Amino acid sequence: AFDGTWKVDRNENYEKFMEKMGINVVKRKLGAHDNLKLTITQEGNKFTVKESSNFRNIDVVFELGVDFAYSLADGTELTGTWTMEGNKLVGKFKRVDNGKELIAVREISGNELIQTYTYEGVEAKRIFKKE
Ligand SMILES: CCCCCCCCCCCCCC(=O)O
């Protein structure tokens, strides 16, 4: 499953995606080399994601199908839910400032974790390798 420690390996169109979100040139360069690592653990229907990066270290806890709030490193607030679809986790979120939709998907491909995002017509991916 998703269980395990994952470390980012490569990105696809991440800087353009961050530009759309409103992130400055400098912060995009730092964002793209954030050394993000995720430690995922499950307990029933609830997941615990320990996010660790050059920017911060925090725990994210969520129950499938129940909305929760999550903030980006820069303070941008989102609210949404994750649900299990087939073998994938599909996340439906909204920016609380502008009300715009942001979708995220987590899926396993071989031994890699692929995280895809879409926002205002732009797609980006972050691919992680298992530790
Ligand atoms: C510099 C800003 C990068 C923005 C990337 C989009 C973040 C959306 C991901 C949603 C994650 C929710 C918490 C989780 O399940 O780990």
Swiss-Prot record:
The keyword Cytoplasm applies. It is found in: Cytoplasm. Gene3D superfamilies: 2.40.128.20. One of its GO terms (biological process) is intestinal lipid absorption. InterPro entries: Calycin (IPR012674), FABP2 (IPR031272), Fatty_acid-bd (IPR000463), ILBP (IPR031259), Lipocln_cytosolic_FA-bd_dom (IPR000566). Induction: By peptide YY. Its main location: cytoplasm. The modification N-acetylalanine is found at A1. Tetradecanoate binds at W82, R106. The keyword Iron-sulfur does not apply. CDD domains: FABP2. PROSITE patterns: FABP. Expressed in the small intestine. Expression in the mucosal cells of the ileum extends from the midvillar region to the villus tips. Changing V60N: Reduced thermodynamic stability. GO terms for cellular component: apical cortex; cytosol; microvillus; nucleus. Keywords: Acetylation, Cytoplasm, Lipid-binding, Transport. Pfam families: Lipocalin (PF00061). GO terms for molecular function: fatty acid binding; long-chain fatty acid binding; long-chain fatty acid transmembrane transporter activity. Hexadecanoate binds at W82, R106. It comes from the Eukaryota. Forms a beta-barrel structure that accommodates the hydrophobic ligand in its interior. FABPs are thought to play a role in the intracellular transport of long-chain fatty acids and their acyl-CoA esters. FABP2 is probably involved in triglyceride-rich lipoprotein synthesis. Binds saturated long-chain fatty acids with a high affinity, but binds with a lower affinity to unsaturated long-chain fatty acids. FABP2 may also help maintain energy homeostasis by functioning as a lipid sensor. Belongs to the calycin superfamily. Fatty-acid binding protein (FABP) family. This is Fatty acid-binding protein, intestinal. It comes from Rattus norvegicus (Rat).
